[PDB]
Amino acid sequence: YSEACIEACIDCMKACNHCFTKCLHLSGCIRLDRECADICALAVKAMQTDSPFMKEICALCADICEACGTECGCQACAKACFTCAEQCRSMAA
Amino acid sequence: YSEACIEACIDCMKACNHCFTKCLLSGCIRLDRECADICALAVKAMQTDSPFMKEICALCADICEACGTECGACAKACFTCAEQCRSMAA
Amino acid sequence: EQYSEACIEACIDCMKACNHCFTKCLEHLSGCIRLDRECADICALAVKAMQTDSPFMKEICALCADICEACGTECGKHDHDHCQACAKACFTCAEQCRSMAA
Amino acid sequence: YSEACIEACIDCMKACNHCFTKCLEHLSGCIRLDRECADICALAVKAMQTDSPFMKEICALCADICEACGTECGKHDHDHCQACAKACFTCAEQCRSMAA
Structure with a gap:
């Protein structure tokens, strides 16, 4: 069941991309927002395509989401980042 | 606002990616890949408030129509996405 | 890559320059930062489209030219942080993409 | 420094994308992995060029996908597969160095 993790990733993308634009000492949040939004997208694609690396991608996505959060x-x-990390850890297990 | 179009793009991504894997039809496979990729780009454009959002959505609609x-x-998902993208692109 | 190798190269060069500019600007530049991200991303897509002989390659290249023209x-408008x-790389890429898009 | 790893990723993208299109004109596993590998190589390039804080982790992932794609x-002797x-294995080795 990947629907819930996909939704959390999509929500995290949205929040990170909005934070990126609004932020534009925020240089660290901007950098992470970009990387987090990019890895969330990759995780969505991995889950949607049934990739053999879905779990590894999800694990990475969690780590990045946790750092971005x-x-x-920004608040x-x-929140969206920590939720997405939690869901990605579950998928990765 | 963009929530409905984003939701249609995400549904189209899902369907195109599922179709790609199941087909693996060479024309459908090629278009499934391109359509999924352009849907993802349209989601990003809407989520980042890109100045090219309308142009990207227009392209996305064209590709979705062809893929469908x-x-x-x-x-079905492609035609739904195309119509939502045409509305956004106006 | 008989017909796309040059345009591919210009897109790869533009990605490099845009990504470099993005990072340097981050260490009045917010518009450059935003466009650098968009332009690097579309250039990568155009490379993929050309390499995979994608049926929307010409349309993708036309979009890439538009985004490159705007990023450039x-x-x-800025004289440091790799912006000039x-x-230049953006304008080169736009011209090559316009040729591919024809 | 990342120039050599970037170059290997760019070469691997080129080879995977070429292989994808040729295979489409028992190759379904190669077609799937060509797509994923070309995509992750593009991401690794971006991560290195932008000095992204997860560059090392992304390079590690790129190595794993490259190794699987290779x-x-x-296992196949036409359609640019060999x-x-080769480009996949070269890339993987450069990415493993960058990931350290």
């Missing part, structure tokens, strides 16, 4: 924590972004 | 025509579930 | 215009180099 | 394409395998 820590740095933005909406941090 | 060739695949014609995927076809 | 915005980066061209980025503008 | 292993699968390496060339694709």
